Write a protein that binds this DNA or RNA. Sequence first.
RNA 1: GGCGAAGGCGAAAACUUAGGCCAUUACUGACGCUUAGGCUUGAAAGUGUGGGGAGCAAAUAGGAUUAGAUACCCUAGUAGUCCACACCGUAAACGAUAGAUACUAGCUGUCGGGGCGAUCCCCUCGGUAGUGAAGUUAACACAUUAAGUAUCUCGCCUGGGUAGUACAUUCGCAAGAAUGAAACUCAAACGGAAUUGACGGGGACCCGCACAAGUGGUGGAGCAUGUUGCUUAAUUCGAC
Lengths: 53, 154, 114
Amino acid sequence: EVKNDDLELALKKFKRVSLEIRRLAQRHEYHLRKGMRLREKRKIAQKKRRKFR
Amino acid sequence: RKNRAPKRTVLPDPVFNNTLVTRIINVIMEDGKKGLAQRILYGAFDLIEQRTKEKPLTVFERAVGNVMPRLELRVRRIAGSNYQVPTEVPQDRKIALALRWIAMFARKRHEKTMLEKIANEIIDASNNTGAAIKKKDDTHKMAEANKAFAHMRW
Amino acid sequence: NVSSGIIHVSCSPNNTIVSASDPGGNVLCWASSGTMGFKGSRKKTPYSAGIAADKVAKTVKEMGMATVKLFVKGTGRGKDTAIRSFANAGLSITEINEKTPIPHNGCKPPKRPR
RNA sequence: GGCGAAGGCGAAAACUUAGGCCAUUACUGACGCUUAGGCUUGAAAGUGUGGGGAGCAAAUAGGAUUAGAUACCCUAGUAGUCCACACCGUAAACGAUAGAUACUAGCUGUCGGGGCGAUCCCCUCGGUAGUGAAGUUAACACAUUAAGUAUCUCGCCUGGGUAGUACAUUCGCAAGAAUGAAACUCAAACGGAAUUGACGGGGACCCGCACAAGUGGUGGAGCAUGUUGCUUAAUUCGAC
């Protein structure tokens, strides 16, 4: 994710991309069953569909 | 819990013209007797003119300025082996704690008679020795050592 | 002895490391929370990472450092304090990028602690 | 979201191959459903043989915590976790809802096929979700994918603990699986649903010398006084 021009306007999107990178990285560092993968993924999708609509 | 508590007012003494002197005379009071502490403090004043000839108000404000603490310490724990948190305190409590330190350290010394011990206390407070400035320096040194906790706290 | 370069920082959940490097891949100097006096559990704080980044910026200033890329690594709450340290240091930072050791869904990681 | 009867199936490609959907004037001419017995498949773990073995990680050792810790945490760490050939045939193998057929308000979606036709929309035939009428339901709830209106067939159940145990029988290298009681004992049960409270190291909100802050005291000495125990003639009786 290479984006930076002068001082700070890149940094806000840097926080956004860092947040999504952390989101994607947390669920590939602790092991548990595949059924848990599927159920948690559906739970997250339901959260996105209910909050962001 | 409760709500914000208003404070009762303290009137300045219209002879040396300083309300901090009134807080001096209040804190150094025991048994609820303004007369005895008043005579003690005024004898200490007379001693201030007696040796190290200088304005008692000037040495008073110098002692206040030297003894005042920059930061305070607040307790916010999570589990066993609690951890301190240094926070910011307004000037009113800062001078209150400075006066409290002067009062408590004054009645902890040699030179048994109260007049000379309190006079030496105010002299040392003006001159920045280990009588009270040591305690303030210590409480400052524990601060900004774990300032990581101070930055992220509540 | 070089103007351009890259400095890497890896904010682990338990610690942090910062390292200034030349574009050739060699390191110039590194710093970490352990380099400072305080140790133990108290080293995983954003303030510690901030002071480590301050020290590494200081010790690269004498080298004559100039415009520099930034690759931030690891996950934690202390990585952004290094950004503040470097921006306030007046250095000539030019580009930001993300270089966590992110894998595809391959090898099995450790478990749920419980 | 899609497919599969189920278990399951998602980086890319080739071969073989499955079944599925819509319209079918075509053909055949009741050739259908269910299915005891029989056969096939069937998550993980486990077994045998040869490989392979990065990471993870039973068992095992060590460091912490604790009163103890053969656990929760950390550092290692073996089987195993992967592939080839044979076996085991269990799971909360669940929609806790057998299969088949026809009918019975509605609404909101979504996906596949056809036509009209820039998508957007229209409708048709189907799958898959949500909402909801009557009706059913002990209630929760189900409701065109019924737990409704009925029929056909199969399998299953007859209080609880004994006990999915024992004996016998079949299979299996084994672990074990299938099948499956009684003697005795209780008057009820880890019964179901729902209701009022209570409680929560469950949340949301709010008070109080509660916390916070400060000041001043008790546990340190001696005496006054009450109480507990012992004593004797009572050390009258209660308050705990």
